[PDB]
Amino acid sequence: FSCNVDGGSSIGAGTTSVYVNLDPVIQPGQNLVVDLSQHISCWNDYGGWYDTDHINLVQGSAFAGSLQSYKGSLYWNNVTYPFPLTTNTNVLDIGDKTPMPLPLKLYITPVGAAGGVVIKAGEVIARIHMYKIATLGSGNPRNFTWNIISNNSVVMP
Numbered sequence: 001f002s003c004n005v006d007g008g009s010s011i012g013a014g015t016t017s018v019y020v021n022l023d024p025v026i027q028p029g030q031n032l033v034v035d036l037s038q039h040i041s042c043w044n045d046y047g048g049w050y051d052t053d054h055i056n057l058v059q060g061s062a063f064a065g066s067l068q069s070y071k072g073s074l075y076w077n078n079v080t081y082p083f084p085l086t087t088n089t090n091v092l093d094i095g096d097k098t099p100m101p102l103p104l105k106l107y108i109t110p111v112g113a114a115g116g117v118v119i120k121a122g123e124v125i126a127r128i129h130m131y132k133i134a135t136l137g138s139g140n141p142r143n144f145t146w147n148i149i150s151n152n153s154v155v156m157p
């Protein structure tokens with residue numbers, strides 16, 4: 001099982017930065033939508049539904065310390081969960097070698113945010129843990145973390 005970010009080199013485990021554009025201005029009452037399907041794709045390394053991969057997101061995935069007061073939702077594979085995640089998500093099954101963009105969106109509601117710059121460019125905004133286990137043998141389980149990083153400032157007036 002492998003993934004990539006923005007069409008880059010293959011990743012089999014570990015932590016990877018995922019850079020995203022955010023609305024540069026956020027009004028109170030509004031949320032930020034982060035569509036991670038635009039960045040992260042994964043695939044089965046054999047294809048043909050031979051040793052199918054089973055992927056889910058993991059309890060504990062959260063905003064990153066500075067933004068832990070924030071509220072959110074996490075859409076994954078037909079279900080929208082409260083974020084930070086308090087349980088493991090449903091399983092997505094990956095059997096084709098053709099990359100599948102992850103069906104993954106984060107909705108962010110800044111809470112307790114003070115005026116001016118609320119998110120910095122280069123700031124890790126959320127850490128999403130993803131778990132993989134396949135079908136044959138032990139399943140060769142692997143952990144991924146997606147460190148979601150803003151490409152730009154976000155300001156609130």
Ligand SMILES: OC[C@H]1O[C@@H](Oc2cccc3cccnc23)[C@H](O)[C@@H](O)[C@H]1O
Nearest residue numbers: 001002043044045046051053134139140
């Ligand atoms: O995705 C289908 C399977 O891929 C297996 O890994 C690979 C198989 C074949 C070629 C690969 C090339 C690079 C990385 N891995 C590869 C995993 O060992 C198994 O656990 C399951 O994930």
